[PDB]
Amino acid sequence: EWTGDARDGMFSGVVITQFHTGQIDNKPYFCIEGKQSAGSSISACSMKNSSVWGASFSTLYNQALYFYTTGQPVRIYYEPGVWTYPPFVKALTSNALVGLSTCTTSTECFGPDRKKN
Amino acid sequence: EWTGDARDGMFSGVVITQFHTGQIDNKPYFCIEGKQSAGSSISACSMKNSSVWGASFSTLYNQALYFYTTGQPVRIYYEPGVWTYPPFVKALTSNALVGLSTCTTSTECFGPDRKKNSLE
Amino acid sequence: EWTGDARDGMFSGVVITQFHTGQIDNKPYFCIEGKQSAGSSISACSMKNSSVWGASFSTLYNQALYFYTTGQPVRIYYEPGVWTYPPFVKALTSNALVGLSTCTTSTECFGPDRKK
Amino acid sequence: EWTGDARDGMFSGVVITQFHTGQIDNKPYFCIEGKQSAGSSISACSMKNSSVWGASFSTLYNQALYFYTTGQPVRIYYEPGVWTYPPFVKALTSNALVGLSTCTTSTECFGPDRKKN
Amino acid sequence: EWTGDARDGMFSGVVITQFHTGQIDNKPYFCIEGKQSAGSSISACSMKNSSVWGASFSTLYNQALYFYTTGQPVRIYYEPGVWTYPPFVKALTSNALVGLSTCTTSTECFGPDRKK
Ligand SMILES: O=C(CO)N[C@H]1[C@H]([C@H](O)[C@H](O)CO)O[C@@](O)(C(=O)O)C[C@@H]1O
Ligand SMILES: O=C(CO)N[C@H]1[C@H]([C@H](O)[C@H](O)CO)O[C@@](O)(C(=O)O)C[C@@H]1O
Ligand SMILES: O=C(CO)N[C@H]1[C@H]([C@H](O)[C@H](O)CO)O[C@@](O)(C(=O)O)C[C@@H]1O
Ligand SMILES: O=C(CO)N[C@H]1[C@H]([C@H](O)[C@H](O)CO)O[C@@](O)(C(=O)O)C[C@@H]1O
Ligand SMILES: O=C(CO)N[C@H]1[C@H]([C@H](O)[C@H](O)CO)O[C@@](O)(C(=O)O)C[C@@H]1O
Known part of the structure; x- marks a missing residue:
């Protein structure tokens, strides 16, 4: 597997606006939320182990908290359907966070594309 | 277990105002205190292993020290009665810190509720 | 053991003014020094493992460097007589650093008392 | 091996302008891109384990994120042809990041040279 | 062994002006350079494991990058003759970085002397 696999998905030019940290089944995790210029939202979590x-x-x-601090537009790479515990999914998301990139524009960011072919 | 389990409890729109760090029984711990809008205090401790x-x-x-630094209003998720050693509970609290979120208002915050359901 | 044990000791309302890192016996250590408004000084070291x-x-x-950076008055919790290598005691202190707290006043700080 | 071995290569006076973070084969990696001025580009990645x-x-x-943040001109020490997974090389680079240094000019930087005879 | 052993050496009131990070023989290292106002110069490297x-x-x-960032005059504790691989010594230094201190003056700094 790789962040740049030809799969869903990525959102570009997002500002990370929300940050959550918790624990589930002995595993620390964090989640972020960000909006694009047009108001479109994306959430993704990363869970330890x-x-x-x-x-x-x-x-x-580390990188998520950095970008939340600067408030610069970044690309969120995610994989839908990873988290399955229904309370967790409802409160948060099924999307795993799978990478991050700085952006030069709202569509053009540093790194691989992560799109279904 | 889960931060978002329908249990006590959470305090929203909290400013982390105080920070303590110590050790008990070979385990580092830290404790925070925060204020809500009306001047009431919340306290909660996290202990390694x-x-x-x-x-x-x-x-x-890391996240608590970060929010202490910004002075952002945040959600403290806690579980009451975790710490049992009386001198500790007395000086500090029995609350374990179980989570943190940023907030959009003093009342609306990112992530799950940690709240007991009501009886209809 | 506990930071809040009824033992020597604690200095409240201290600004951390000095910082030293080094190595002894294959372990990194750091020391801090701070003065109260009253000019009373306190040194204490922490050693890895x-x-x-x-x-x-x-x-x-982490916390000590943080506090050294903000310049805010804090409580230093310590245990005297811990470090015993005589040249180390002489140059620095026998005091172990055992906890830290933010303060509201020169005497009132978050967390337990550490006092006999 | 050594950062300062007489081989390819180094780019001095580089400002790090782009930052990417992802995962491949159970390993987090980051990747950076910088511009000399000059005006030419170097990308390099480091990968955990x-x-x-x-x-x-x-x-x-740590060091790359630090230098991305300050925007100071720095030396990138790299080893070409380290990353070999072809879609990774295509989207990113084959270059391993093998060192970093502060610079006094666009060309003069602290540390060893890394260049072939 | 100890930062404070009666050996060479230390340079007080040094501003860390240059920073290098690399790897040799599967170990990360960093090196710092600094000058002490009169412009006398010191290099030292620390290498993991x-x-x-x-x-x-x-x-x-952590401490050296912190001090590079503030730009404050500090003490560099070093031990000469530690790095022996000749191209490394030629490009950088033989000196191991052994400790760091904040300073109150160009000559007085927190912690032990490292003095032969
Ligand atoms: O189709 C998806 C599914 O994640 N994402 C696309 C994504 C979304 O459709 C779009 O961002 C939603 O506003 O648009 C992209 O232009 C981008 O933001 O980089 C390309 C990306 O492939
Ligand atoms: O009743 C409890 C027990 O922790 N907590 C509630 C909590 C507390 O009653 C309140 O924060 C204390 O004044 O109020 C909430 O509005 C909140 O702060 O999110 C809802 C939360 O469930
Ligand atoms: O007597 C000692 C020995 O550490 N410490 C006391 C301490 C010292 O006497 C005092 O700080 C020295 O100036 O005063 C305290 O008010 C404090 O600073 O918190 C109480 C503390 O027990
Ligand atoms: O030939 C290469 C291949 O890495 N790099 C050289 C490099 C290139 O000619 C230059 O960066 C243009 O890519 O110039 C150097 O002056 C430097 O930037 O330090 C010396 C360096 O050895
Ligand atoms: O003799 C040495 C070898 O490092 N160093 C001395 C050192 C150097 O001679 C001096 O710093 C070089 O300018 O001077 C000291 O005043 C100091 O900077 O602390 C004392 C120190 O023992």
């Missing part, structure tokens, strides 16, 4: 994407927890937490 | 919320010590420590 | 207080090294280092 | 240069991940992550 | 001073790499890294 959980899923394929568990290895990225610390790096993503 | 403790009972059920110990796995979140590092994340919570 | 040390006997009793070593589990706290990482949190205390 | 990667084979040769993985020991340096956490140090380089 | 080296036989003697390796334990303090990440603490010294």
